[PDB]
Amino acid sequence: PTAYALAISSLGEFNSLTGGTSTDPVAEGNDYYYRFEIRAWEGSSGPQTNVTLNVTRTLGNSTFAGSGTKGVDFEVELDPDGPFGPASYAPVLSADVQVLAWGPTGVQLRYLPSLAPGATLRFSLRANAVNGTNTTVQADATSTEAPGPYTVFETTTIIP
Amino acid sequence: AYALAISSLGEFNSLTGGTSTDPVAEGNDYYYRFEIRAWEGSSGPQTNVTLNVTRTLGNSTFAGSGTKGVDFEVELDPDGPFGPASYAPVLSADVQVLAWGPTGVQLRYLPSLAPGATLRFSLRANAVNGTNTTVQADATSTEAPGPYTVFETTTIIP
Ligand SMILES: [Ca+2]
Ligand SMILES: [Ca+2]
Ligand SMILES: [Ca+2]
Ligand SMILES: [Ca+2]
Numbered sequence A: 001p002t003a004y005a006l007a008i009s010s011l012g013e014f015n016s017l018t019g020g021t022s023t024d025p026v027a028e029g030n031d032y033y034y035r036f037e038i039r040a041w042e043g044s045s046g047p048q049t050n051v052t053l054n055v056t057r058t059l060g061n062s063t064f065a066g067s068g069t070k071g072v073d074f075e076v077e078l079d080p081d082g083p084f085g086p087a088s089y090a091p092v093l094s095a096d097v098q099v100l101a102w103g104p105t106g107v108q109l110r111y112l113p114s115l116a117p118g119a120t121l122r123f124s125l126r127a128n129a130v131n132g133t134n135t136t137v138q139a140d141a142t143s144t145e146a147p148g149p150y151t152v153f154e155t156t157t158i159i160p
Numbered sequence B: 001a002y003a004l005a006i007s008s009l010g011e012f013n014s015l016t017g018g019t020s021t022d023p024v025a026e027g028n029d030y031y032y033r034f035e036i037r038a039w040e041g042s043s044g045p046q047t048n049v050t051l052n053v054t055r056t057l058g059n060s061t062f063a064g065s066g067t068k069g070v071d072f073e074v075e076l077d078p079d080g081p082f083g084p085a086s087y088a089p090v091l092s093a094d095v096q097v098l099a100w101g102p103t104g105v106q107l108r109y110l111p112s113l114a115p116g117a118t119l120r121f122s123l124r125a126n127a128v129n130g131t132n133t134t135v136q137a138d139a140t141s142t143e144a145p146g147p148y149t150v151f152e153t154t155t156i157i158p
Helices: none
Strands: A006-014 A031-040 A051-059 A074-079 A097-103 A106-111 A120-128 A135-142 A150-156 B004-012 B029-038 B049-057 B072-077 B095-101 B104-109 B118-126 B133-140 B148-154
Touching: A006 A135, A006 A150, A006 B148, A031 A051, A031 A135, A031 A150, A051 A120, A074 A097, A074 A106, A106 A120, A150 B004, B004 B133, B004 B148, B029 B049, B029 B133, B029 B148, B049 B118, B072 B095, B072 B104, B104 B118
Parallel strands: none
Antiparallel strands: A006 A031, A006 B004, A031 A120, A051 A106, A051 A135, A074 A120, A097 A106, A135 A150, A150 B148, B004 B029, B029 B118, B049 B104, B049 B133, B072 B118, B095 B104, B133 B148
């Protein structure tokens, strides 16, 4: 059997930090947002601690924007019962997310509360579009109990 | 003149609608969803818009022999995010299945894809193992060869 497991998925690119519509391609000089989901297995023995997202630009010239302010540069929402219950995504408190790194090529965010079995976190991250070459980002999820690696690669077409 | 985009939408427990999944338990079916999106600034419509999906890691397989409405679905949103028209299924004859096997599928949309329009592809897979499945999805057209590629990953509970 298995004690703990995590999943990651890309949801694509968006024109707003929360709600709004999907985009890609994006015109050079515009802000756009990446969204990723980290999901705890419903069969997990208990809560998972130090659930971390690490996102790095691998290709292209788009940069993660700003200095890393919650509600502007990034947002983290918790769906407490995931797809197993009718509770919706809601923003978490500022004190629940630690910004371990925030730079143009790389961000790292840790969720401090434990993540219950079946619960899902949605991360939204602001980028600045630059160039006529595709931007690719690698997104990696870990917890103390489930180190992974769990990795996706999302690609954005930037119109020059 | 022309440009295309691709995005992963993650994994689902149904071919259309239902809810998001991942992790998946071994022995269950699940569905990958990908979107190909024509640039709204494109000169004209784009022909032979193709999705190629291949397994890069793990043991999960694309399921069945490639029957529309069972193993895969293609939906068109004719104005994409720029207009309030929704996704609707396309006719069986609008989608050419160039390849369909356990490690690889290739699907071509035969009508031309208008500037700003989006295609959403759903593909049935069989979950096997205690190692992550990774799939590579590539989009191409005649006028925007790309290739444009994403890599989506599924946790399989053994
Ligand atoms: Ca996934
Ligand atoms: Ca819920
Ligand atoms: Ca994309
Ligand atoms: Ca629409």
